[PDB]
Amino acid sequence: QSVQVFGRKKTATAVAHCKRGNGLIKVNGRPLEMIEPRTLQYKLLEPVLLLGKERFAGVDIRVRVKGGGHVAQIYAIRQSISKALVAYYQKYVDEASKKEIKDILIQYDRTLLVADPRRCES
Amino acid sequence: TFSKVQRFWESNSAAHKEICAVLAAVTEVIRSQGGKETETEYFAALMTTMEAVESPESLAAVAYLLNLVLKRVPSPVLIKKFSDTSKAFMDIMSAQASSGSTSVLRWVLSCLATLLRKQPVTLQVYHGLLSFTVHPKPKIRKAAQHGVCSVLKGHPAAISTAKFCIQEIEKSATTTLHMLTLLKDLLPCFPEGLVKSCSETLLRVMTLSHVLVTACAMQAFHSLFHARPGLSTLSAELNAQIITALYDYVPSENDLQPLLAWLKVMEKAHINLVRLQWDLGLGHLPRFFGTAVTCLLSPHSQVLT
RNA sequence: CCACCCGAGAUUGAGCUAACAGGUCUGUGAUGCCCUUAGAUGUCCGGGGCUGCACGCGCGCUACACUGACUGGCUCAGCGUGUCCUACGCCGGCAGGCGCGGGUAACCCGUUGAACCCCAUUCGUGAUGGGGAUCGGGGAUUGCAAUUAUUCCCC
Numbered sequence: 283q284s285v286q287v288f289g290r291k292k293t294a295t296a297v298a299h300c301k302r303g304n305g306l307i308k309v310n311g312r313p314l315e316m317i318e319p320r321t322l323q324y325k326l327l328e329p330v331l332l333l334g335k336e337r338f339a340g341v342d343i344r345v346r347v348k349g350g351g352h353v354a355q356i357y358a359i360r361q362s363i364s365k366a367l368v369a370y371y372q373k374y375v376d377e378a379s380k381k382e383i384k385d386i387l388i389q390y391d392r393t394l395l396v397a398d399p400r401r402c403e404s
Numbered sequence: 405t406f407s408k409v410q411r412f413w414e415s416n417s418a419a420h421k422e423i424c425a426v427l428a429a430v431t432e433v434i435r436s437q438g439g440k441e442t443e444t445e446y447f448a449a450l451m452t453t454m455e456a457v458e459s460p461e462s463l464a465a466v467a468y469l470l471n472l473v474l475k476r477v478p479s480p481v482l483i484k485k486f487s488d489t490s491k492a493f494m495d496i497m498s499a500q501a502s503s504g505s506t507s508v509l510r511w512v513l514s515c516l517a518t519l520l521r522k523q524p525v526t527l528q529v530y531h532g533l534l535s536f537t538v539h540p541k542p543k544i545r546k547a548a549q550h551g552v553c554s555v556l557k558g559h560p561a562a563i564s565t566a567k568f569c570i571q572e573i574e575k576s577a578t579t580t581l582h583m584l585t586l587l588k589d590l591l592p593c594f595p596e597g598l599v600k601s602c603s604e605t606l607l608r609v610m611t612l613s614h615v616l617v618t619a620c621a622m623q624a625f626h627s628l629f630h631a632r633p634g635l636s637t638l639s640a641e642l643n644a645q646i647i648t649a650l651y652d653y654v655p656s657e658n659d660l661q662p663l664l665a666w667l668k669v670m671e672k673a674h675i676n677l678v679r680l681q682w683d684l685g686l687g688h689l690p691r692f693f694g695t696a697v698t699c700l701l702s703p704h705s706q707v708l709t
Numbered sequence: 710c711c712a713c714c715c716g717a718g719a720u721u722g723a724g725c726u727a728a729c730a731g732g733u734c735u736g737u738g739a740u741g742c743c744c745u746u747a748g749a750u751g752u753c754c755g756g757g758g759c760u761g762c763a764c765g766c767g768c769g770c771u772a773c774a775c776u777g778a779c780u781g782g783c784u785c786a787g788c789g790u791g792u793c794c795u796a797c798g799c800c801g802g803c804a805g806g807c808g809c810g811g812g813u814a815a816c817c818c819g820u821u822g823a824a825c826c827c828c829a830u831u832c833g834u835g836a837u838g839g840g841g842a843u844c845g846g847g848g849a850u851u852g853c854a855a856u857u858a859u860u861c862c863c864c
Contacts, residue, residue: 286613286653293786297613318784319827346613352785352826402787504810542816577820616815 285369289361292401294350296358298366303342305335309359310346317359319352326356329364332390333383341370357393364394405446408434412465426472434469435476442476444485454496458503467511474518482522489519490529497532509536510547517551521558530561534568537586538579545582553589565590566598570605580609584620591628596639599628603646610653619662622669625650629672632679640680647673647688654695660704667696667707 284301296309307314307330314326324331330338345362347355364387371380387394412426419425437443450466457463482489493516500509516533520526533555536548556562569583569590576583587602594602606621628638647670655662670692677685700708 284652288613288656299611299613321827347785348820349786355785506810540817541811545816578816581816614820 285366285373287362287365287369289358289365290397291354291357292350294347294354294358296345296347296362298343298345298362300341300343300366300370303340305339306342308344322353322356326360328360329367332386361394361397408469409462409465412468413461430472435473442473442478444478444481460505464507464511467508467515471511471515471518474515477522479522482519486523487525490525494532506541506543510543513547513551517554520555527564530564534565537582538572549585556590556593559593562594563598566594566602570601573605573609580617581620584617584624587624588620588627591624592631592633592637594637596637596642599638600642607649622662622665625669626665626672629669629676632676640684643673643677644684644688658702658704660707663707
């Protein structure tokens with residue numbers, strides 16, 4: 283009845299746990315508006331602002347984030363939230379909603395589903 | 405017959421390797437106290453030294469000698485004066501917990517474990533032994549864990565420790581590894597309802613994604629399914645519930661640390677389903693075979709093998 | 710590779726310290742010369758110097774500020790280490806002292822509680838509160854010894 287995904291950027295890894303909810307999006311016990319780089323706030327509302335709160339009506343998602351910096355953590359957060367929604371709609375919702383959401387997200391930006399293979403090199 | 409406390413009191417590598425020392429001969433001939441093995445007159449006579457004296461390297465030495473001598477089964481005498489041993493040892497426990505020494509506490513916990521293995525107040529002594537697993541000292545904690553394992557595997561006391569371990573899971577982040585070691589070493593000797601409760605709580609800590617606690621608690625899965633538990637310890641329907649509940653994580657596709665032991669634990673679990681009820685095991689097998697066929701697409705050869 | 714049937718024979722006899730450049734290194738000569746109270750650096754002791762500074766040729770650090778300086782709050786790493794790495798409490802303006810524990814180490818330091826960065830305050834285009842050299846005083850550790858400032862702290 284729940285799904286568990288991960289999303290990485292450089293070193294930062296954000297793990298997202300998604301379940302039947304009431305429309306709350308939570309990270310590290312803090313609301314998504316309550317993350318300290320408010321300059322980069324619209325990047326982390328991109329799934330919500332792109333997709334609306336109507337399809338986030340009955341979804342409870344929690345994200346716990348390890349490592350990295352600040353920007354890499356934010357990208358890991360948005361990637362993990364998006365993969366959590368995609369896997370939840372894979373396992374518990376139909377497939378047409380899956381391909382519709384994936385088409386919207388890919389036509390917006392590529393990094394929000396697939397991770398950047400580049401990392402810090404020796 | 406004394407001065408063995410002064411023999412173990414000296415700590416030099418030239419004298420540890422001697423045959424007369426505490427390495428070999430104390431384990432053999434010192435147990436025969438007065439020609440007959442064994443007498444706790446040494447134990448009852450060292451009350452005057454183990455009370456109101458906190459001198460190091462003498463309390464630890466007599467604790468070491470008591471731990472080494474106590475194993476040679478004075479069982480009816482132990483059943484008789486278990487009350488005296490428990491009271492003396494709990495006041496020693498409280499004094500050492502207020503003081504903060506390691507060796508004396510470690511060996512009195514070891515000989516307490518020997519005492520409890522050989523044998524209402526016994527439940528109090530069991531919680532006294534059990535309370536020092538979350539103790540931060542690696543030498544106290546390992547001794548307490550090994551002692552609890554020796555007591556349980558050598559049971560009416562499984563209920564208290566199962567409820568306890570669930571409880572300090574629920575309050576608690578570095579003691580999580582220690583109580584997961586407790587589960588890894590104590591899961592087979594639990595009753596079915598407590599197995600269900602520990603499994604549910606263990607999935608509740610599977611909700612977090614710290615790699616160490618997840619890996620060691622799924623190693624506790626490996627430990628519970630590896631021992632081939634009986635019907636009263638693990639039922640078929642509970643095993644079916646925890647095998648259909650464990651399908652919800654599948655780390656990713658290519659993590660290679662939890663994936664191999666993951667296929668190992670569903671291997672052991674499906675073996676247990678087949679051993680308990682073969683038709684139900686064959687019924688739950690196809691999802692496992694489908695997921696296995698799916699995870700042969702991993703880029704790592706170790707996952708494939 | 711082993712064993713066996715058949716077969717006379719499933720292996721019975723002859724010939725082949727020497728060579729190396731493959732590596733590499735301190736023994737033989739009654740060896741040639743030059744030295745030997747002109748010790749192929751004679752041992753030890755005390756104190757200095759190696760830093761000395763007009764100047765050239767070059768690696769670097771800090772800067773010349775407003776994309777900034779100060780003050781407060783916020784929140785994120787990894788490669789590595791340790792019987793000297795330090796956890797906790799007390800005395801401390803601060804360098805630091807005192808009593809105590811763990812760690813010969815995926816355990817304790819350490820969820821390594823990092824800095825840039827972010828959000829608020831003051832400054833307001835000038836040798837400025839930017840920049841910190843050079844000096845004057847005190848204090849504390851390291852070490853037999855800090856005078857030619859070892860280092861760190863405070864005006």
